[PDB]
Write a protein that binds this ligand. Structure first.
Ligand SMILES: O=c1cc[nH]c(=O)[nH]1
Length: 225
C-alpha cells in the first residue's frame, strides 16, 4: 500500500486540483512560491506510507530563498539552520546520547528513516508566512493524517503547537503514540518544547515494538569522485 494507492482518489478532487492550479497561477503571476513545484510533495517521496515510523507536523514551509524543499523544518545544504530547527537541535543535544550540533539543517536522512516531515500547508508565497494557508492544503493534509491513522499501526506522532495538536486530535491514541509539546519556534520553544524529550521518547516507543530507533543526527549527501 503506497501513498498513491490511498490518495489517488483524493488527488482527483476539485479542491485539490484547484489548489495546484492556484499555485501554478501564482508562480507565473510575478511572485515566487516556495518550495519549487518538484519539491512540494517531497515528504511523500522520501517516506512511503508503509515506511512511516514518526510523524512530525509543521505548519507553514519556510518562505525564504533556498530554505523550503518539501520537508517540514529542513533547509537545503549550505543554508543557515533556521531558528526552529536550531531549537530542535538544542533539545536533541540535551537528550540524545552522543548528539552534537550539525553543521547543516538538511533532514532528508530523517525522512529516509521513516520520519514523515509533513507541513499541513505545502506552499507559501516568498516572505509571506501562511499566505497559502487557505488554498486547500489543510484539507489535503487532514486526509493524509487520517489515512495514516487508519492504515498504519504504532506510528509515533510528534504534535508541536496548538495547530498540529488540533490537526492530530482525531488520531487513535491506543493504536498510535501521540506526544504533545509547544512549537520549537523561538516564540514558544522555551515554554515547554525544551525538556519535552520527544526524540528519546519516540525511540523508546519504537524500540518497545521491535522497530529500530531513529538516528537523529542528520547527514549531508556525500561527495563522489
Ligand atoms: O517547514 C517548516 C519550517 C518551519 N516551521 C514549520 O512548521 N515548518
Amino acid at each position: 500500500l503506497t501513498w498513491h494507492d490511498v490518495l489517488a482518489e483524493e488527488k482527483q478532487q476539485p479542491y485539490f486540483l484547484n489548489t495546484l492550479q492556484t499555485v501554478a497561477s501564482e508562480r507565473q503571476s510575478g511572485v515566487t512560491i516556495y518550495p519549487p513545484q518538484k519539491d512540494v510533495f517531497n515528504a511523500f517521496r522520501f517516506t512511503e506510507l508503509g515506511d512511516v515510523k514518526v510523524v512530525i507536523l509543521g505548519q507553514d514551509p519556510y518562505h525564504g530563498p533556498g530554505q523550503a524543499h518539501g520537508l517540514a523544518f529542513s533547509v537545503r545544504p549550505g543554508i543557515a539552520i533556521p531558528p526552529s530547527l536550531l531549537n530542535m537541535y538544542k533539545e536533541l543535544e540535551n537528550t540524545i546520547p552522543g548528539f552534537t550540533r550539525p553543521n547543516h539543517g538538511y533532514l532528508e536522512s530523517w525522512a529516509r528513516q521513516g520520519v514523515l516531515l509533513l507541513n499541513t500547508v505545502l506552499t507559501v508565497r516568498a516572505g509571506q508566512a501562511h499566505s497559502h494557508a487557505s488554498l486547500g492544503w489543510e484539507t489535503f493534509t487532514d486526509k493524509v493524517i487520517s489515512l495514516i491513522n487508519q492504515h498504519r499501526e504504532g506510528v509515533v506522532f510528534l504534535l508541536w503547537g496548538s495547530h498540529a495538536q488540533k490537526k492530530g486530535a482525531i488520531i487513535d491514541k491506543q493504536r498510535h503514540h501521540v506526544l504533545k509539546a509547544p512549537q520549537p519556534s523561538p516564540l514558544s520553544a522555551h515554554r515547554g518544547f525544551f525538556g519535552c524529550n520527544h526524540f528519546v521518547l519516540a525511540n523508546q516507543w519504537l524500540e518497545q515494538h521491535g522497530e529500530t530507533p531513529i538516528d537523529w543526527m542528520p547527514v549531508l549527501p556525500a561527495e563522489s569522485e
